[PDB]
Every structure is written in C-alpha cells, then in structure tokens.
Amino acid sequence: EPSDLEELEQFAKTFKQRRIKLGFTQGDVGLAMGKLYGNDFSQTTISRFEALNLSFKNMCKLKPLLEKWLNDAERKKRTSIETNIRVALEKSFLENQKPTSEEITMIADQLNMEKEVIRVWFCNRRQKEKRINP
Amino acid sequence: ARPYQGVRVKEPVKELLRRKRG
DNA sequence: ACCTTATTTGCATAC
DNA sequence: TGTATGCAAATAAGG
C-alpha cells in the first residue's frame, strides 16, 4: 500500500539527488516514462513531484511508477486555444453562460472547432466564474 | 488585484508538511 | 450524452 | 538552459 507522509518527503530528496546522479533533467525523466508505460508525464508534473506540490493521492499514484524507472533502467494532448477564439468565446459566454448541447454544436461548427473542446470550454469556464466572481 | 484566474491543487504535500510542523 | 464538483496534468512563459 | 508557475485543458465521479 502507498506510504505515509513521513515517507513521501524522504523519497523527494532521494529522487532529486539520485536524479542528477545519472544526469537526467526532470523534462527527460518525463519522456523517459513515455517509452516505459504507454504515455507520460510532462516536466511540470515531475517538477511538482520534487517540490511536493501534489495531493496525497496524486503523489501516491506516482511514487511507485517513479521508483521503477529509477530503481531499474528501461490522455489527450492539451488543446491551446488561439487568443482570437478565446475572446470570441468569452463573448458567447457573455451572452449565455450555459448553452444547450444544440447551441454548443452550432457554435463549434460556426467557428470550426471540435464540438467536444467547446462543450468543455464552457464547463471549465462556468467553474472559473464560480471561483473568480461569486 | 488579480483574483487568480486558474485552478489549484488542494492540500499539496508541500503545504501539508509546513502545517504539521508549526 | 450533458451538467456538476473535484482534480490532475501540462502549454507557455515567466525565473 | 534547466526549473518553476500562472491559467486552464482533460478527466474522474455522482447525478
């Protein structure tokens, strides 16, 4: 079973010191587990592991996978919306914060955008509102 | 006054440590 | 097949 | 040139 707090911060410096020992940046350790698991984790994710910037679970699900790669040797790519579609969308939000799966289709198409990414854009956005202005 | 548009990790082990110390 | 809340990741670009 | 981090996509999980 996954370790407790008193063991996680320990693995933290162990991984950092033992990492630059075999000469491998966190970014390289990322594409390293790529050719070891089916997919991978970015330089950011690995960074956050080092500085212990992750929840209990998110780090307990990683300690074992990280130690395999170090012990012995060996998800959809994020969509970045162009600022012109980020502003365009902000407007339709400003018209209606929750469009029907129909309107949503009629917007994605009306803008040449994968229907899904849009259904999601409004979701994260609505949640954003709730965080930003209550 | 930037409100911090963007999401955060709740209870990162980093802060979880500095908490159970003082 | 979609929303909601909660979270995990990770472009991008500031250090 | 490696490392953080802001802002925020993708995903997980209960309806």
Side-chain angles (χ1 to χ4, degrees), chain A residues 2-6 8-9 11-16 18 20 22-34 36-38 40-56 58-73 75-90 92-100 102-134, chain B residues 1 3-22:
Chain A
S3 306
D4 80 292
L5 160 67
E6 213 52 76
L8 276 295
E9 74 293 78
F11 192 81
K13 198 180 190 298
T14 306
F15 215 86
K16 210 177 200 300
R18 219 177 182 275
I20 198 62
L22 291 181
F24 247 155
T25 72
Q26 48 194 233
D28 301 336
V29 182
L31 181 55
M33 284 183 224
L36 177 67
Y37 292 116
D40 60 274
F41 282 103
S42 68
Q43 168 245 323
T44 316
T45 296
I46 173 64
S47 165
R48 301 171 173 168
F49 197 124
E50 300 187 340
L52 295 172
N53 280 69
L54 283 171
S55 72
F56 196 74
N58 200 191
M59 200 166 269
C60 281
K61 177 196 175 185
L62 297 177
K63 176 178 118 66
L65 269 45
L66 285 259
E67 85 184 304
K68 173 192 174 182
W69 184 85
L70 185 59
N71 195 108
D72 49 278
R75 170 177 261 287
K76 203 251 175 157
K77 305 301 189 72
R78 180 189 192 90
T79 296
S80 73
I81 297 103
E82 303 161 310
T83 41
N84 75 111
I85 290 186
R86 260 208 297 260
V87 157
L89 285 171
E90 276 294 335
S92 300
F93 184 47
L94 262 282
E95 188 197 86
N96 187 38
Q97 295 187 320
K98 184 171 174 175
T100 55
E102 205 296 87
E103 296 183 272
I104 276 186
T105 307
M106 189 176 113
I107 297 172
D109 175 46
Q110 173 250 267
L111 200 48
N112 189 22
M113 292 298 270
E114 187 176 284
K115 172 170 167 58
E116 179 68 349
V117 179
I118 308 310
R119 186 191 67 66
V120 206
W121 190 83
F122 272 94
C123 288
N124 294 313
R125 188 58 184 87
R126 284 177 218 127
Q127 281 187 269
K128 184 181 168 182
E129 279 295 272
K130 295 168 160 297
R131 292 191 303 279
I132 303 320
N133 42 93
Chain B
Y4 190 162
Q5 306 175 338
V7 179
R8 302 193 198 207
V9 180
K10 291 307 171 297
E11 306 190 309
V13 190
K14 176 185 180 180
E15 198 163 48
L16 277 178
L17 270 170
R18 89 170 191 88
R19 186 175 301 172
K20 195 182 174 297
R21 288 183 171 180

